[PDB]
Amino acid sequence: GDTKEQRILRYVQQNAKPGDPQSVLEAIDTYCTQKEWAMNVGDAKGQIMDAVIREYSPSLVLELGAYCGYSAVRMARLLQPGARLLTMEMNPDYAAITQQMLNFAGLQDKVTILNGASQDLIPQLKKKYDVDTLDMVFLDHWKDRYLPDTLLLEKCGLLRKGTVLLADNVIVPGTPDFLAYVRGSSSFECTHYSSYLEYMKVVDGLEKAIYQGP
Ligand SMILES: O=C(NCCc1nc(Cc2ccccc2)n[nH]1)c1cc(-c2ccc(F)cc2)cc(O)c1O
Ligand SMILES: [Cl-]
Ligand SMILES: [Cl-]
Ligand SMILES: [Mg+2]
Numbered sequence: 001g002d003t004k005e006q007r008i009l010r011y012v013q014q015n016a017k018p019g020d021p022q023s024v025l026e027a028i029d030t031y032c033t034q035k036e037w038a039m040n041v042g043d044a045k046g047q048i049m050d051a052v053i054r055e056y057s058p059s060l061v062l063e064l065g066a067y068c069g070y071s072a073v074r075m076a077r078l079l080q081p082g083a084r085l086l087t088m089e090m091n092p093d094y095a096a097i098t099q100q101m102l103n104f105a106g107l108q109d110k111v112t113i114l115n116g117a118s119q120d121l122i123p124q125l126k127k128k129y130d131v132d133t134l135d136m137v138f139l140d141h142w143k144d145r146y147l148p149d150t151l152l153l154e155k156c157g158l159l160r161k162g163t164v165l166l167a168d169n170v171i172v173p174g175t176p177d178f179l180a181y182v183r184g185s186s187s188f189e190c191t192h193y194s195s196y197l198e199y200m201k202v203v204d205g206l207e208k209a210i211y212q213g214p
Pocket of ligand 2: 042
């Protein structure tokens with residue numbers, strides 16, 4: 001008390017413009033470069049995310065892991081009018097920071113926070129949250145959950161031909177089982193985007209895995 005996440009939110013509120021997502025991203029990146037490192041996707045990998053979002057213009061995006069809402073703000077600002085982001089966050093303190101971050105950025109109408117474990121929420125998406133299929137999934141939660149949640153998404157019928165999975169941290173901390181699985185599966189077309197760990201001179205990367213159907 002206070003936490004790093006509360007300090008990041010306060011910094012944004014006092015160093016960005018309300019309703020200006022770009023200024024929010026810049027404020028978070030400045031804080032995390034100059035004051036305290038935090039596990040936001042960051043600008044380096046964020047620019048790759050931007051390129052992917054702009055290519056596919058997804059109407060419905062699922063994010064696994066919100067943290068402080070950096071990637072939610074990053075993706076939501078590039079969504080077309082009426083397009084929507086659902087973000088799953090198990091940590092209630094993170095969920096509170098993310099909501100306030102979205103509110104400040106003026107993106108609250110485009111993004112909905114789902115509270116709970118992804119393994120509990122994913123099976124509820126169709127009946128409770130009126131989802132048919134997902135256009136894109138951003139994986140950025142517990143690294144050992146990338147593979148089981150991907151398999152659960154398929155089981156629940158939430159993936160379609162062309163659904164884009166984009167996974168953060170496939171190098172550091174790394175997601176070896178997920179990476180081996182999607183790269184070895186005929187149901188995925190994979191591309192690796194080499195980059196750097198947020199705010200650090202350390203190699204990381206994103207994996208894009210496009211679902212091909214069964
Ligand atoms: O752990 C990370 N992220 C998960 C954060 C998170 N966990 C939740 C709980 C939740 C659970 C289930 C479902 C939805 C949410 N929400 N958000 C993460 C770590 C690092 C990193 C750390 C130390 C280091 F030395 C190097 C790198 C870098 C990263 O980019 C990351 O994303
Ligand atoms: Cl993030
Ligand atoms: Cl960065
Ligand atoms: Mg990450």
